[PDB]
Design a protein around this ligand. Structure first.
Ligand SMILES: Nc1ncnc2c1ncn2[C@@H]1O[C@H](COP(=O)(O)OP(=O)(O)OP(=O)(O)OP(=O)(O)OP(=O)(O)OC[C@H]2O[C@@H](n3cnc4c(N)ncnc43)[C@H](O)[C@@H]2O)[C@@H](O)[C@H]1O
Ligand SMILES: [Mg+2]
Length: 215
């Protein structure tokens, strides 16, 4: 971020609007956005291939060690020195501990963890309208956050596309493993005294204003 550096984690249900908020956070605060789901889809599309692909499209978690490898690689290259926002990582307690080691080894620390509160029925409506620009990871919603022109990305004009993990059985998996494995991280970070909550059910601009109040 330079003068606007923060070291931020967003935790929230699959589908809660973290990558949408990361667009303003990257741009306003100059932070590196690390979505390990987008990082995995980029490791896939460049041919961590078919087995990771199936695991993601089933809605299950990829191995802790695989994702900790990809995050550590960003930190080791210097991508995060100007601040970062982690989105979808950590999502298990071994990943949180692995991250604490990575930060301990550089002497940096977390600024804030922001927990997006939203219920599972609204997440199903958020995912059902989603489409994505695959090269950039930008996301739109056909009802609540549409592209400016039909069917295409606002920046490149390239087509928007479906995500294969947005099928009904994987949405159920994603929500189930989130409540079992990821939700415990809210106490993990409240115990460190750095967790704040936002009402992710509100319209996207109102969620952005709540986030700005915390940053
Ligand atoms: N650490 C890790 N460990 C192990 N496995 C890992 C892992 N990280 C990744 N994985 C694996 O990879 C998979 C993919 O991970 P990932 O790509 O992170 O998927 P996810 O966890 O299911 O989360 P999403 O990306 O779907 O949600 P989001 O919070 O980014 O919401 P978005 O802004 O898109 O918004 C959704 C929709 O809502 C719209 N929207 C946003 N805000 C609003 C609003 N306020 N009102 C109405 N609509 C809204 C959006 O336009 C969009 O249509 C995981 O399921 C797992 O298999
Ligand atoms: Mg996302």
């Amino acid at each position: 971020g330079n003068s606007k550096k923060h070291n931020l984690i967003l935790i929230g249900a699959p589908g809660s609007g973290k990558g949408t908020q990361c667009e303003f956070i990257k741009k306003e605060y100059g932070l590196a956005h690390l979505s390990t789901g987008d990082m995995l889809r980029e490791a896939i599309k460049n041919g961590i291939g078919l087995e990771a692909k199936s695991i993601i499209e089933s809605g299950n978690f990829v191995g802790d060690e695989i994702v900790l490898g990809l995050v550590k690689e960003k930190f080791d290259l210097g991508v995060c020195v100007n601040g970062f926002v982690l989105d979808g990582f950590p999502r298990t307690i071994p990943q949180a501990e692995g991250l604490a080691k990575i930060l301990s080894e550089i002497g940096d620390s977390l600024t804030s963890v922001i927990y997006f509160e939203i219920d599972d029925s609204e997440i199903i409506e958020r995912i059902s309208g989603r489409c994505t620009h695959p090269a950039s990871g930008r996301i739109y919603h056909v009802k609540y956050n549409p592209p400016k022109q039909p069917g295409i990305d606002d920046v490149t004009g390239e087509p928007l596309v479906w995500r294969d993990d947005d099928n009904a059985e994987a949405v159920k998996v994603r929500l189930d493993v989130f409540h079992k494995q990821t939700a415990p991280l809210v106490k993990f970070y409240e115990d460190l005294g750095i967790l704040k909550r936002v009402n992710a059910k509100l319209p996207p601009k109102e969620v952005t204003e709540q986030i700005k109040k915390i940053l």
